[PDB]
Design an enzyme around this catalytic site. Structure first.
Site, PDB file in Angstrom:
ATOM      1  CB  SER A 206      -2.364 -23.186 -37.087  1.00  0.00           C
ATOM      2  OG  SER A 206      -2.648 -23.314 -37.712  1.00  0.00           O
ATOM      3  CG  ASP A 574       0.116  -0.628  -6.550  1.00  0.00           C
ATOM      4  OD1 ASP A 574      -0.357  -1.338  -5.739  1.00  0.00           O
ATOM      5  OD2 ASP A 574      -0.636   0.510  -6.785  1.00  0.00           O
ATOM      6  CG  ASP A 585       8.093  -4.449  12.240  1.00  0.00           C
ATOM      7  OD1 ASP A 585       7.598  -3.573  12.637  1.00  0.00           O
ATOM      8  OD2 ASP A 585       7.636  -5.807  12.703  1.00  0.00           O
TER       9      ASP A 585
END
Ligand SMILES: [Ca+2]
Ligand SMILES: [Ca+2]
Ligand SMILES: [Ca+2]
Ligand SMILES: [Ca+2]
Ligand SMILES: [Ca+2]
Ligand SMILES: [Ca+2]
Ligand SMILES: [Ca+2]
Ligand SMILES: [Ca+2]
Ligand SMILES: [Ca+2]
Ligand SMILES: [Ca+2]
Ligand SMILES: [Ca+2]
Ligand SMILES: [Ca+2]
Ligand SMILES: [Ca+2]
Ligand SMILES: [Ca+2]
Ligand SMILES: [Ca+2]
Ligand SMILES: [Ca+2]
Ligand SMILES: [Ca+2]
Lengths: 613, 616
Positions: A206, A574, A585
């Site tokens: 705070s 994603d 590959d």
């Protein structure tokens, strides 16, 4: 991890974090102890008057705001015992050669007119031979010693208001004006013990979170630059420093947290102020009785609406955030991970589903982590991808869909599917994982959940049925819902071969060779570096945990990769974020783990065949 | 009087108001009893935690907000008993033939969605034969039955917020929505019993004040115009109806009171909103521990600062304003009179002076009324004109100058002059009035003050100062063997007298009856007293004092070096000067104060100057 800091790793960041929390909790001297206890027994509605009684007078097991009630515990001594258990001992004014004000507890007090109600704790960590290894600097938030609480709080509130409405750099200069001298004496003390700026942890909550950011702002120029490379972790600060030095942690439903931008008062300041902030954890919810309440939230979310301050109280910071630290899902998290922390009272816990309401906050994206309590919880996942953790107690889970990990923890735990058993497929690897696949292809990996509840209309014409999870199927007494066709391996290296009808293939540990068939198979390589061959059909490949360096052969158009509980997934990542070509590959990398889709071009892949959770 | 309402006049508007307060208090069912009792003992500072404990849990002599605590008194039975002592008995749903909701206490609850937390009491006053003579309608402000306090309060506050931020006319229609059907039954129940609108009193505090104003706004057009002539007294209302029907009573340091204008949320709504308002009492202060405290007032005054809400609480409304209703000064006051009410806690009362701080308010004009408690008070009048009232208890007064009336009340009371006795003149009419005149000519009329304190030059030739306490006696102020003499006097009788001043100058005390006061070449002070008096100057520089119901008087020989002084006289509106009271009648100026008057024989009005005619 959500609390990663600087370039300290996961583990060092967590250790830093726990220390900051510990020294932050000490600076309040258990002032909200009575509130916490009253709330836990009574809640925040009907029983709020009773909660408030305890906030003031505590009880047999807590101390509220009023000191010297004989039947209360000595919460202040518990607070000192707690900080020492964490490894911290107050450094006396005497050891620093400080000529300013302290009180009987060794708390240091602000040095100048307008800052005399400021408080800070200077603490040491000493090794076995008793040398100083670390200094802790915890600035107290709004409030002061129980003896002078009201008057001390009034001082602090003027300071708070000046942060929002006074000189433009008021908040930035707070620590300079309040503790400039104390800090020079601290620099001298560290030097004399062979410590530099890297050996100093700065925390507080705070107003004391404001102080953290203040010192960070001042650290380049003042105290001879000594504190520039110090460690700054601030809780529930209304402000954020202009430096990149501070980790600003808070609950998104704490209305104090990020109230200012970084110290500017804005229209947002008295409402919802949930914009993304580089320095802050943006998406941590304290699921407390207020947040859960429909009634309470007919009122506007605002720092001006005092009941909303329940989410600000430091004991729930320490208790809820500690459980984020302890969590099995911790290393899945990052700074802006959506995380829901179970913080309900005892009576609300009995009948309230802990879930992402997304109340009073910007739209949450990416996976969601729900962290339970060590008591009996009701946890409800969303329709997106969820990580639900029961911890101890007899927990009950619901979930709305998608791709999920559900960890029962200790106790007798239950997953309530709310639908017929016939709309799901179940598999079990023999090693403590129950897979639940729903009518939409969404898969839940479950552990330590021994009962599955389903709704059977055409057995109970108006209808819950409880199934036990066993090695031979889901059982209702003697009656069995069979697991899907599987080949279970061992923790050795196995060769596993699917039948033409399709099988779930469970490598378990070791470098396994999983050979699919013409059927639709589900491949769970497990830990270790696995070779997986499709064999045809429409196959699912599932990757979870520290899954290894896998090779996938014969992957096509109609196949699905599923990543769930894997490293390095930023909110809403994603596949493209994780994918490259190496030779002929496509490789997908998640932390140190990887999948190689042999002979598959990056451009042939579609996000609908690639689930990242 | 400050609470004059419509054309009921002084006394009947007082009895109206006490009725309004009695039913307003009932509607809260003593919810704030534990706070009041906690505050009285603990105060609002160091003691604030203990004060809040009592607010929630009460004690052995109060009930806080929490029901069913064995050792609390039944504060809700006490509230019922109190509204009954006041003349009222709640009217049952069956008597009204009301099909809505009521709870076990007979309280009626709001009718529509979003008004279910509204509450109203409908009460009846009955004569000696048991016939209904009056209906009371008391809308509850924010809060609800103890059994459901929090959830009910949340509903109420949602309503408060819509008053400010919702559909235009939300406040206007509130009573229409919450109690439209109940009011139709009340109309039919009143007609059944021989009553019309004029026999209906409508009241309530806070949100219930808002409800008073709503019902006033709607009374013209709804329920068949039945309540258009009802009586409407609202307490601490944030709104003011658009009609001329509502007396809006409130403390000016109460942040809820007048928050909106009259339904519009402005910049001032979240601060000081003390603009004069026609329907409202603009200048009544609750002199409570918060108002007194320099530390609290470091914080900005706002409805958003919850501590400022101490000035909003209903018990301090009932208790303070009842002392106003009872004041010996009541009939001097008008709607916008500056009135300071002693509302301190027991620990604050022993060391804080009650005074017009004018905090968080527009500048106060005109005379100031300060009303004490029945305990020992410290009361500080200002440098302007003051009316100080101790009431019971051993009270101490100070005052910064001007023209004043100081009534000690019962007890052993003290006037602390804070300077040497040598800078004051003292007179005594033998009828209980001790007069104190300062070095500037300012006069205080005092009653029931037996002790005068002065600050005298003391040791090391006046480096140190002595505080000397003098007793007020027939022969002078007395301290041990030392007598401070009264100024030379002639005293009359309660019958007709002719009194003559010696040439050195006298105070001439006519007392009751029509007296003939003959001045001399000296500086005389004339006090015709009650009755119709003839007073001639004789020359010199004279003073004519008029106080109370001073009759019709004739003053001859009034010149430019003389002075009239009106103190405690009827009809002085805040900051009135003599021109508001002066006309010519033939050759004479006539000054009129209610039914009383002074005729300045042969003086022309236009030769007068405010310097020589003091109005307080
Ligand atoms: Ca403080
Ligand atoms: Ca957020
Ligand atoms: Ca889900
Ligand atoms: Ca649990
Ligand atoms: Ca569990
Ligand atoms: Ca294996
Ligand atoms: Ca394996
Ligand atoms: Ca296959
Ligand atoms: Ca693997
Ligand atoms: Ca209510
Ligand atoms: Ca005023
Ligand atoms: Ca005065
Ligand atoms: Ca008194
Ligand atoms: Ca006479
Ligand atoms: Ca007379
Ligand atoms: Ca004369
Ligand atoms: Ca007269």
């Amino acid at each position: 991890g959500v609390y990663d800091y600087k370039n300290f790793g996961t583990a060092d960041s967590k250790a830093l974090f726990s220390d900051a929390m510990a020294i932050t909790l000490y600076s309040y001297h258990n002032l909200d102890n009575g509130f916490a206890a009253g709330y836990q027994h009574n809640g925040f509605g009907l029983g709020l008057p009773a909660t408030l009684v305890t906030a003031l007078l505590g009880g047999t097991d807590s101390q509220g705001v009023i000191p010297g009630i004989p039947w209360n515990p000595d919460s202040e001594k518990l607070a000192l015992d707690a900080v020492k258990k964490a490894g911290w001992t107050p450094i006396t004014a005497s050891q620093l050669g400080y000529d300013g004000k302290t009180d009987a507890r060794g708390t240091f007090f602000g040095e100048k007119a307008g800052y005399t109600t400021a408080q800070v704790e200077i603490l040491g960590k000493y090794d076995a031979q008793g040398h100083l290894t670390e200094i802790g600097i915890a600035f107290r938030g709004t409030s002061g010693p129980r003896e002078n609480l009201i008057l001390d709080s009034i001082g602090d509130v003027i300071n708070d208001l000046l942060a929002a409405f006074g000189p433009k750099d008021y908040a930035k200069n707070y620590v300079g004006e309040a503790f400039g001298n104390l800090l020079n004496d601290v620099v001298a003390f560290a030097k004399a013990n062979g410590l530099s700026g890297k050996d100093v942890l700065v925390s507080g909550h705070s107003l004391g979170g404001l102080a953290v950011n203040s010192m960070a702002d001042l650290s380049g120029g003042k105290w001879g630059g000594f504190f520039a490379d110090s460690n700054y972790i601030a809780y529930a600060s209304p402000t954020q420093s202009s430096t990149d030095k501070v980790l600003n942690v808070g609950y998104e439903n704490d209305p104090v947290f990020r109230a200012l931008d970084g110290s500017t008062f804005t229209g947002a300041s008295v409402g919802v102020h949930d914009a993304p902030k580089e320095s802050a954890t943006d998406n941590i919810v304290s699921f407390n009785d207020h947040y859960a309440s429909t009634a309470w939230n007919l009122l506007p979310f605002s720092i001006l609406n005092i009941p909303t301050w329940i989410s600000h109280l430091p004991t729930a910071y320490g208790d809820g955030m500690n459980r984020i630290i302890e969590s099995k899902f911790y290393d899945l998290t990052s700074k802006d991970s959506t995380i829901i922390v179970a913080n309900l009272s005892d009576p609300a816990r009995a009948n309230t589903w802990v879930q992402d309401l997304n109340r009073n906050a910007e739209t949450h994206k990416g996976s969601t982590f729900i962290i339970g309590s060590d008591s009996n919880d009701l946890i409800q996942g969303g329709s997106g991808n969820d990580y639900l953790e029961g911890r101890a107690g007899n927990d009950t889970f619901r979930d709305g869909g998608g791709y999920n990990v559900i960890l029962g923890g200790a106790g007798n735990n239950t997953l309530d599917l709310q639908k017929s058993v016939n709309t799901f497929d179940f598999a079990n690897d023999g090693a403590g994982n129950l897979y639940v696949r729903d009518a939409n292809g969404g898969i839940s990996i479950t552990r330590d959940i021994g009962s599955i509840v389903t709704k059977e209309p055409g057995f109970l014409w108006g209808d819950d049925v409880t199934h036990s999870v066993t090695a031979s199927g889901l059982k209702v007494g003697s009656n069995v819902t069979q697991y899907d066709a599987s080949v279970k391996g061992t923790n050795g290296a196995d060769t596993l071969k699917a039948h033409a009808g399709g099988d779930w293939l469970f490598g378990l540990d070791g470098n396994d060779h999983l050979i699919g068939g013409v059927g639709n198979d589900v491949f769970v390589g497990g830990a270790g570096n696995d070779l997986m061959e499709s064999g045809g059909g429409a196959d699912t490949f599932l990757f979870n945990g520290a899954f290894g360096q896998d090779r996938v052969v014969g992957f096509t158009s109609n196949d699905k990769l599923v990543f769930l509980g894997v490293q390095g997934v930023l909110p809403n990542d994603d596949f493209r974020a994780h994918a490259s070509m190496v030779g002929q590959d496509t490789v997908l990398k998640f932390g140190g783990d990887s999948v190689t889709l042999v002979g598959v071009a990056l451009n042939s892949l579609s996000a609908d065949g690639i689930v990242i959770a």
